[PDB]
Amino acid sequence: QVADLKAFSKHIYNAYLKNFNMTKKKARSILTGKAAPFVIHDIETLWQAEKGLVWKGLPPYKEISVHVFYRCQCTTVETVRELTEFAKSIPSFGSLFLNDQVTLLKYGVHEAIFAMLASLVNKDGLLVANGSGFVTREFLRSLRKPFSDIIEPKFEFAVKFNALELDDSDLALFIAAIILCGDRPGLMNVPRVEAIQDTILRALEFHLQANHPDAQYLFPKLLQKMADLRQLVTEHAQMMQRIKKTETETSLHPLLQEIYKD
Numbered sequence: 001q002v003a004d005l006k007a008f009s010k011h012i013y014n015a016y017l018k019n020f021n022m023t024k025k026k027a028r029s030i031l032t033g034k035a036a037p038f039v040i041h042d043i044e045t046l047w048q049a050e051k052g053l054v055w056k057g058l059p060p061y062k063e064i065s066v067h068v069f070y071r072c073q074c075t076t077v078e079t080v081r082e083l084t085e086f087a088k089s090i091p092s093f094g095s096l097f098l099n100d101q102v103t104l105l106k107y108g109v110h111e112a113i114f115a116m117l118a119s120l121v122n123k124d125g126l127l128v129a130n131g132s133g134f135v136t137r138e139f140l141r142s143l144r145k146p147f148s149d150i151i152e153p154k155f156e157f158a159v160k161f162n163a164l165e166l167d168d169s170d171l172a173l174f175i176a177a178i179i180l181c182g183d184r185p186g187l188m189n190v191p192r193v194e195a196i197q198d199t200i201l202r203a204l205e206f207h208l209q210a211n212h213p214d215a216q217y218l219f220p221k222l223l224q225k226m227a228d229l230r231q232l233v234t235e236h237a238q239m240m241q242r243i244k245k246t247e248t249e250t251s252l253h254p255l256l257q258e259i260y261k262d
């Protein structure tokens with residue numbers, strides 16, 4: 001087992017470095033000022049940032065709240081695309097039935113995504129694009145409800161998550177575990193997913209005992225954060241449904257539309 005585990009963790013860590021445009025290692029040095037980000041904090045900085053300083057269009061919007069809402073959708077779509085390629089490299093994810101892969105992604109990407117935004121976060125805002133911009137929490141608290149309500153819970157999750165001091169090597173296995181979940185609805189081969197998931201959790205448990213020797217309780221602490229993410233994402237989807245019911249001008253990217261189908 002043990003040399004298997006260490007090498008299974010290595011391959012997952014490699015898949016992660018290979019597939020994600022941003023790492024917490026790069027985020028954390030930018031945010032501390034070892035590695036500059038353009039500060040987005042109102043209409044005119046968003047315009048500046050989108051005119052090439054941060055991004056290189058969007059469905060028409062009529063106000064800054066919808067506009068940011070659509071910027072959030074762009075990111076999520078970009079993160080879903082990279083999460084898919086990451087997963088296509090986790091051991092034997094690739095060998096599940098193609099529909100179970102899709103089901104596992106349909107139902108786990110927003111949990112993974114919310115774990116990973118956290119890497120980009122400090123109490124005051126978060127890095128965006130690939131570290132080229134910094135959006136202030138005050139600007140986002142300023143948007144009108146329901147938009148600002150759907151954003152703030154992610155900063156609350158993020159800061160507490162960051163208090164645990166995970167690094168990219170840890171997050172690669174955490175994210176793998178969130179995606180290989182035997183209880184998503186509609187899965188066909190539960191036992192096999194459940195089985196890959198158990199190898200992943202044994203790999204993480206091992207990895208955390210090596211990589212974080214003094215944190216004696218980190219492992220069940222991280223199991224609980226996955227449960228916090230499930231609830232965080234329950235809440236999120238209830239707010240997206242509220243926005244769909246009440247803000248009828250606004251639209252949803254087609255991929256998000258499938259993900260949300262039902």
Ligand SMILES: C#CCOc1cc(COc2ccc(C(F)(F)F)cc2)ccc1Sc1ccc(OCC(=O)O)c(C)c1C
Nearest residue numbers: 040068071072073075076117128135150151154155158256
């Ligand atoms: C942590 C934290 C704060 O929460 C977020 C932060 C981001 C980072 O991306 C942004 C990029 C640009 C902008 C800007 F500049 F337009 F303000 C804001 C945020 C992106 C998304 C979220 S939360 C989120 C995630 C997904 C999502 O909708 C798409 C979906 O649910 O599938 C929406 C509407 C939201 C609000």
Ligand SMILES: CCCCCCCO[C@@H]1O[C@H](CO)[C@@H](O)[C@H](O)[C@H]1O
Nearest residue numbers: 080084102105106255258259261262
């Ligand atoms: C890249 C993976 C992203 C996953 C998001 C796509 C999930 O949507 C589902 O895709 C299926 C097509 O296979 C349809 O049969 C379902 O009705 C639909 O809900």
